[PDB]
Design a protein around this nucleic acid. Structure first.
Ligand SMILES: [Mg+2]
Ligand SMILES: [Mg+2]
Ligand SMILES: [Mg+2]
Ligand SMILES: [Mg+2]
Ligand SMILES: [Mg+2]
Ligand SMILES: [Mg+2]
Ligand SMILES: [Mg+2]
Ligand SMILES: [Mg+2]
Ligand SMILES: [Mg+2]
Ligand SMILES: [Mg+2]
Ligand SMILES: [Mg+2]
Ligand SMILES: [Mg+2]
Ligand SMILES: [Mg+2]
Ligand SMILES: [Mg+2]
Ligand SMILES: [Mg+2]
Ligand SMILES: [Mg+2]
Ligand SMILES: [Mg+2]
Ligand SMILES: [Mg+2]
Ligand SMILES: [Mg+2]
Ligand SMILES: [Mg+2]
Ligand SMILES: [Mg+2]
Ligand SMILES: [Mg+2]
Ligand SMILES: [Mg+2]
Ligand SMILES: [Mg+2]
Ligand SMILES: [Mg+2]
Ligand SMILES: [Mg+2]
Ligand SMILES: [Mg+2]
Ligand SMILES: [Mg+2]
Ligand SMILES: [Mg+2]
Ligand SMILES: [Mg+2]
Ligand SMILES: [Mg+2]
Ligand SMILES: [Mg+2]
Ligand SMILES: [Mg+2]
Ligand SMILES: [Mg+2]
Ligand SMILES: [Mg+2]
Ligand SMILES: [Mg+2]
Ligand SMILES: [Mg+2]
Ligand SMILES: [Mg+2]
Ligand SMILES: [Mg+2]
Ligand SMILES: [Mg+2]
Ligand SMILES: [Mg+2]
Ligand SMILES: [Mg+2]
Ligand SMILES: [Mg+2]
Ligand SMILES: [Mg+2]
Ligand SMILES: [Mg+2]
Ligand SMILES: [Mg+2]
Ligand SMILES: [Mg+2]
Ligand SMILES: [Mg+2]
Ligand SMILES: [Mg+2]
Ligand SMILES: [Mg+2]
Ligand SMILES: [Mg+2]
Ligand SMILES: [Mg+2]
Ligand SMILES: [Mg+2]
Ligand SMILES: [Mg+2]
Ligand SMILES: [Mg+2]
Ligand SMILES: [Mg+2]
Ligand SMILES: [Mg+2]
Ligand SMILES: [Mg+2]
Ligand SMILES: [Mg+2]
Ligand SMILES: [Mg+2]
Ligand SMILES: [Mg+2]
Ligand SMILES: [Mg+2]
Ligand SMILES: [Mg+2]
Ligand SMILES: [Mg+2]
Ligand SMILES: [Mg+2]
Ligand SMILES: [Mg+2]
Ligand SMILES: [Mg+2]
Ligand SMILES: [Mg+2]
Ligand SMILES: [Mg+2]
Ligand SMILES: [Mg+2]
Ligand SMILES: [Mg+2]
Ligand SMILES: [Mg+2]
Ligand SMILES: [Mg+2]
Ligand SMILES: [Mg+2]
Ligand SMILES: [Mg+2]
Ligand SMILES: [Mg+2]
Ligand SMILES: [Mg+2]
Ligand SMILES: [Mg+2]
Ligand SMILES: [Mg+2]
Ligand SMILES: [Mg+2]
Ligand SMILES: [Mg+2]
Ligand SMILES: [Mg+2]
Ligand SMILES: [Mg+2]
Ligand SMILES: [Mg+2]
Ligand SMILES: [Mg+2]
Ligand SMILES: [Mg+2]
Ligand SMILES: [Mg+2]
Ligand SMILES: [Mg+2]
Lengths: 59, 102
RNA sequence: ACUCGGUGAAAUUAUAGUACCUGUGAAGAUGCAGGUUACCCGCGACAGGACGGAAAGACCCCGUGGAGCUUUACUGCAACC
RNA sequence: UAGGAAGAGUAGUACUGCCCGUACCGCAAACCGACACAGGUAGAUGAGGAGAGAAUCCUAAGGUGAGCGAGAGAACUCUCGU
RNA sequence: AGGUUCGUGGUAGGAGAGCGUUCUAAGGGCGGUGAAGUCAGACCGGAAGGACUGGUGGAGCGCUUAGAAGUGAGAAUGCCGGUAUGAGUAGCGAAAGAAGGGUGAGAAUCCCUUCCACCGAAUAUCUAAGGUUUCCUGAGGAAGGCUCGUCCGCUCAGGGUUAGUCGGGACCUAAGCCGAGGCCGAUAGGCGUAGGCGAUGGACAACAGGUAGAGAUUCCUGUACCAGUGCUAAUUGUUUAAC
RNA sequence: GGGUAGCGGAGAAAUUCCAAUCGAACUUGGAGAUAGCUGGUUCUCUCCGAAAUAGCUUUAGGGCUAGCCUCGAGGUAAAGA
RNA sequence: GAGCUGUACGUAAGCGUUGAUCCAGAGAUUUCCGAAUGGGGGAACCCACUAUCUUUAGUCGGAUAGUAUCCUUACGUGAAUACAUAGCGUGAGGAAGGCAGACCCAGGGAACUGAAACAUCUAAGUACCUGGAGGAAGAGAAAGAAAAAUCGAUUUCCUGAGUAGCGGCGAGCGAAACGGAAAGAGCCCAAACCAAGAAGCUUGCUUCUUGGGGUUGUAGGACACUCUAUACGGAGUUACAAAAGAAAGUUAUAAAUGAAGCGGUCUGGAAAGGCCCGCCAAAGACGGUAACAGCCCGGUAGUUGAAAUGGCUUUCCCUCCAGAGUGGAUCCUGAGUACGACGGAACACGUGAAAUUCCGUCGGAAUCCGGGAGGACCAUCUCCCAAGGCUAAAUACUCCCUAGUGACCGAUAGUGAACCAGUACCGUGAGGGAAAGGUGAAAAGCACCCCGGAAGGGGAGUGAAACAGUUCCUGAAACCGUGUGCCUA
C-alpha cells in the first residue's frame, strides 16, 4: 500500500557492494510524497512519486 | 448359473461320478449346488434344541457346479445348453437333441 | 545375611579339563620353558590377580575439525554525524 | 427529570418457570511421577486429660493391621541401648 | 600329441582359469508309481563343489548352449528375531497379629465372631482440580495382582446420575485477547478506535426429615420463598392528563 | 487466569533458567552436509612378487613425479652378469 | 431371470416368475461442524432479533423465511457549512475457502560444501516462504538475424561445442547465429479526419462521450478524385464481434449370442496326468474346477444391442461484414517517453575496450528534410520502425479413470502399511512411528466313553493325511530333556 497511485512504483531489492566486492542485501525506495489530489470528484491524501508530479497532476 | 433349483443332474467328475440327482439348493455367490444323495458327510453333533438327541448325522454337502451336467427330459443324456428366445420368453435348449429342456 | 515352602531378574560372556616358583617373550603369564606341588563334587566367608566391569581418556599431542569470548588482527554490516 | 401514556394497581384463587453438571476416587491402588512406586497435590472442619499451644504423650468419633511367609538366633553390614 | 631342460614359500599388489546362486531364450527332459525344501550316511573331483540311497514333505524342478545380475559374510561396541550364562542366585517397595466357625476341588492370604495392636491438626469428615464408568448387582478365575486366592480398582452380562432456589449460561466487569472503518508496511502481515469476549472477583429466591443394591438442598413427606400469567371481586383514572 | 520465544526472552548475576535438553531449546527440511581420520568390505586354485627411499609441498600418520612389481608389444654392428 | 434380507456365523421375522436381491443412466431426501456468513465460542456447542402462522384461559411452547464483511453499481436521506460533499440506509451483482507433496509465472531469498585454508568466486537464483494462475503456463507477428546473399512471428528437438568467451585468468562457469527436423496463422487498437450530443463558458471557441474511419517501412494512412460493392459473395464464437436453437452420425456409461469329448482304459482321495482314439478353431487369451483342460464352467474370436444422460463431428439455422486504383499542398504515425549521469541487477560475459535488457533517483530529445541497430565510438552502407494490446499447434507434468505390459519384489523383500495403518504406542505440542500372511478339496471343526473343578490328555469317529485339531503347509540352528555302546575319582 506504500506505493504511488499513478505509475505505481515502490521498493525493490538489490545489492550493496564494498571495495573487495563483498555483497549484502538492500532496497531502493521511491520518493513518494503524501499529497492531496482528486482521485474522484473529491480530494484525498495519497502517495505520489516526485517523478509523477513534475508534469500532469493537480495538487 | 447354468443349473437351476429343481433340475435333474448327472455328476461328471468326483467320487460320485456317474450318479444322478436333483437340485435341492443353489449357491451362486460361491458357485456350489446341493444335490440329493450325493456327497454325504457325517456330522458329530452335540444335543441341542434342534436335533434333541444329537449324534452322527449323515447329511449332504455341496459340490462345484462344473462337476454337473443337465439331463435332457426326453433323450436322457448330458448336454451342453443353448438359449433361444421363443415367443415372449428365452428358454433353454438341449444342444444335442436340438429341443427345449424347459 | 543363614535353613525351609512360593515366586523369580541383571550387568557380563572367543571356546575352556582354568595350581605355584624361577625364567622367557610387545621388556609385569592360569595357558610358553625347566622344576615343585596336586584324589572327585560342593556349601558359608575374604578380596591378591584375571593389567576385573562400566564410559571409542575429560589430561597430553595431532586435524590446513568445531563452537563461545576479546582486541589499536583483516574485511565488512547496523546505527549515528 | 427528558419522555411514554388510558388504563392501572389492590385482595383472593389457580396455573407457568429453559440449557449444562450431578455416578465414583479425591494426601490417593482411580490425580502428576513408565509401576497397586517411602515423592508431589488449593481450600473448609479438625474432640478430651495434662498444657501457653494446632507442641508432646495416651485416648474419643471415625478409620486401619499395609498383597509373600516360618524358624534358627553364626561371621559381617545397618538402625538402636548400656 | 610327445619329449628335453629349468622351476613350483609368500604380505601389499599385477596376470590367468574356474566353482556356485536368481532370472531369460531355444533345445531336450524329470515328476502323485512322489517336485522343491529338510534330515542321515563309511561315495566322487585338484579346490570352490557334485552325485547316489533311505526317512520326512505334498507340488513343482533339473540338464545343454548362450545372455543378464539386488552374485557368495565370521567379525562393522553392525540392524532385527530367537535362545543361553550369571542362577533357583539378587529382590519380593517402611508397620502386629492370634485362634475358633463357614465356604469351597483346593484356604497363612476370601467371609463371620472374639481378643490384641496402630493413627487420631490424622492414617478422620467435606470439597475444587484432574481421571472418565474405576460406581451397584449377578456370574468367573486363562492373563493382570511382585506369593496364594474361592477374592479384586481384573474378565463377562445387566443396571445406576432426577434441581425455578446448589455450581455455570441465558446478568456484570479485571488482567489479557479479538477487533468494522482507520494508521503503518516487499508479500505475508503489525498496531489500534467504536464494539465485543474473558473469573481467580460483584449481584441473585429452600429448609428439616425419610429413603437397606447403586442419586439426593435434585426423589418423597411437611412447611416456604422468587419471578410471572390468567380468572374472579371490589377500588380508582382518562389526555391541564391515574400510572 | 494471563504476558514475554531462540540473530530471541528472563536473570538481587551462578554461563543462571526457558518441559529430566542450554557458551546458545525442540522438530522438520537443505541432507546421503563434509570427514587428507578410525572401523568394515562376502567363492576357489595357478604364475610372478614389492616398499618403508629421493625431490618439492601450509608439508610432515596426506599428495605428486622418479625409484622398486606385474601384464603386453618391439628392435638390434647383443647391448645385461 | 431365481433367489434374497453386506462383512458375518447364527437365531428370529419376512420378501420374491403379479418378477425380488443385483447392474447402468436420470431424479428426490441429504442432521451438526467446518470459508461458516444472525451474535458468541475451548469443533461438531450456547443465546437471539424481525415478519407471517400456530397451541393454551394465558404466561410457557412450536413452524417457515430473512438477518456477516468487503468491492461495483442504482436510488433515497444527509454534518460542521449556504450550495454541496463526507457519512447513513435499501436494492442488484461479485468475491472469500480448499487442493495433485506434480507441472509455471512473479515477489523475497540461505548455509553447509568446493576452492585441498579463505574474504572475490562456488554451491545457486538452488532449498525454503509468499502471491497469481491454467489445463497447460510462458513466448510470439522484426526499431529482428545477417553480410560480395539474403532470410522472413514464436516454441521444442539434433548439431554447432565443452567451441567462442568469462574467470583470486584459480576452483570452475559456458553461449548464439548458420545447417537439419516437429508444428505452423495471423490480427485488433491510439492519432489524423467525419457525424451527433454534453460540459465549460478557454465567452462563438476547447474538451468530454458515443458512432464511423485507420493501422504501416518498397513508408503507410487522413485528404482529393475515379471503379466496383450494402449481401452477389465472404466470415464466425480456438485470436481475428458475440449469444442461441435443431437434425443426422459416431462414441462412452448396463448387456446378448457364441464351435468342439459325460470317449475308452491305468494310477489315485480326487484326473485336467500316462497310454489309445476323435473333434473344433476368424475361438490354443486368462481364470476356476478335488492334480497340469481349445472341446466341464465363466469366458475367448466373430457378430449384435441403448430407454436415459454426456462428449465429439457434419449440415441447417442464427449472427456479422466494403476493397481496388491514381495523386503528393497540408495533416497524423504511442513524451516526462527514448536516452544520459550516479547506484545496482540480468545477459555464458565478475566493469572490463562493454554493446544489449531491467530497477531506484536526478536531468532530459527528434518527429519523415524523422528515428533505431549491426558488441566502445565516428563516417559510409545495409537492415528495420520502439515507447499499446490479443493469438491455436508442436513443449512440461499425473491426484485420477479405462485397457494393458515387464530377462520388476515375493512377507526382514515390495509402499511405512498384502492383515480394520498413519492404526497401536511415545510426546505439552509441532512431530515421530511399529509388529502382525498360509487347517483342509470340502467344516466333513472330533457324537460317545474314561481320568480331571477346569485346562489337558487316552480311546472312538471324520479325512488321502490329525505327527493337518481353529499361531493349523514345510518345520533348519542355537537352546532344553529322556535312554543308552565306550571312557573317566
Ligand atoms: Mg553472491
Ligand atoms: Mg520519484
Ligand atoms: Mg522531480
Ligand atoms: Mg523352595
Ligand atoms: Mg529366593
Ligand atoms: Mg610349565
Ligand atoms: Mg570341585
Ligand atoms: Mg595439514
Ligand atoms: Mg561449546
Ligand atoms: Mg434453553
Ligand atoms: Mg437441564
Ligand atoms: Mg471420599
Ligand atoms: Mg507445657
Ligand atoms: Mg510417638
Ligand atoms: Mg475407636
Ligand atoms: Mg575364465
Ligand atoms: Mg550350491
Ligand atoms: Mg522346460
Ligand atoms: Mg538339506
Ligand atoms: Mg543334510
Ligand atoms: Mg549329513
Ligand atoms: Mg507324507
Ligand atoms: Mg554386461
Ligand atoms: Mg542379481
Ligand atoms: Mg539381495
Ligand atoms: Mg568370511
Ligand atoms: Mg556400525
Ligand atoms: Mg549387533
Ligand atoms: Mg519372531
Ligand atoms: Mg538381538
Ligand atoms: Mg536372560
Ligand atoms: Mg484365620
Ligand atoms: Mg474397565
Ligand atoms: Mg500376576
Ligand atoms: Mg515375586
Ligand atoms: Mg469355589
Ligand atoms: Mg468387577
Ligand atoms: Mg442453577
Ligand atoms: Mg451475555
Ligand atoms: Mg443464591
Ligand atoms: Mg394474581
Ligand atoms: Mg538459538
Ligand atoms: Mg551465584
Ligand atoms: Mg549449565
Ligand atoms: Mg435430515
Ligand atoms: Mg466459525
Ligand atoms: Mg462467527
Ligand atoms: Mg452444551
Ligand atoms: Mg406465540
Ligand atoms: Mg450520498
Ligand atoms: Mg446546510
Ligand atoms: Mg483459489
Ligand atoms: Mg490449482
Ligand atoms: Mg549469498
Ligand atoms: Mg549464482
Ligand atoms: Mg553461478
Ligand atoms: Mg505456492
Ligand atoms: Mg481451470
Ligand atoms: Mg497443448
Ligand atoms: Mg498464453
Ligand atoms: Mg510475420
Ligand atoms: Mg506490427
Ligand atoms: Mg517480409
Ligand atoms: Mg515433437
Ligand atoms: Mg473499429
Ligand atoms: Mg487508399
Ligand atoms: Mg470318461
Ligand atoms: Mg483309488
Ligand atoms: Mg485324461
Ligand atoms: Mg487368442
Ligand atoms: Mg488356462
Ligand atoms: Mg475336453
Ligand atoms: Mg512529443
Ligand atoms: Mg549502440
Ligand atoms: Mg550505454
Ligand atoms: Mg549480428
Ligand atoms: Mg534490422
Ligand atoms: Mg500474449
Ligand atoms: Mg516365510
Ligand atoms: Mg485354507
Ligand atoms: Mg485349502
Ligand atoms: Mg471330575
Ligand atoms: Mg476335553
Ligand atoms: Mg509332517
Ligand atoms: Mg501337514
Ligand atoms: Mg522338530
Ligand atoms: Mg530341531
Ligand atoms: Mg552314556
Amino acid at each position: 500500500a506504500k506505493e504511488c497511485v499513478i505509475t505505481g512504483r515502490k521498493s525493490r531489492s538489490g545489492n550493496k557492494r564494498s571495495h573487495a566486492m563483498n555483497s549484502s542485501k538492500r532496497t531502493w525506495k521511491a520518493n513518494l510524497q503524501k499529497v492531496r489530489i482528486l482521485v474522484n470528484g473529491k480530494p484525498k491524501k495519497v502517495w505520489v512519486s516526485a517523478r509523477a508530479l513534475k508534469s500532469g497532476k493537480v495538487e | 448359473m447354468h443349473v437351476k433349483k429343481g433340475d435333474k443332474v448327472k455328476v461328471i467328475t468326483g467320487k460320485d461320478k456317474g450318479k444322478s440327482g436333483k437340485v435341492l439348493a443353489a449357491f451362486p455367490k460361491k458357485d456350489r449346488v446341493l444335490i440329493e444323495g450325493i456327497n454325504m458327510v457325517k456330522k458329530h453333533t452335540k444335543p441341542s434344541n434342534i436335533n434333541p438327541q444329537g449324534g452322527i448325522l449323515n447329511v449332504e454337502a455341496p459340490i462345484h457346479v462344473s462337476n454337473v451336467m443337465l439331463i435332457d427330459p426326453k433323450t436322457g443324456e448330458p448336454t451342453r445348453v443353448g438359449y433361444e428366445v421363443k415367443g415372449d420368453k428365452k428358454v433353454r435348449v438341449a444342444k444335442k437333441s436340438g429341443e427345449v429342456i424347459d
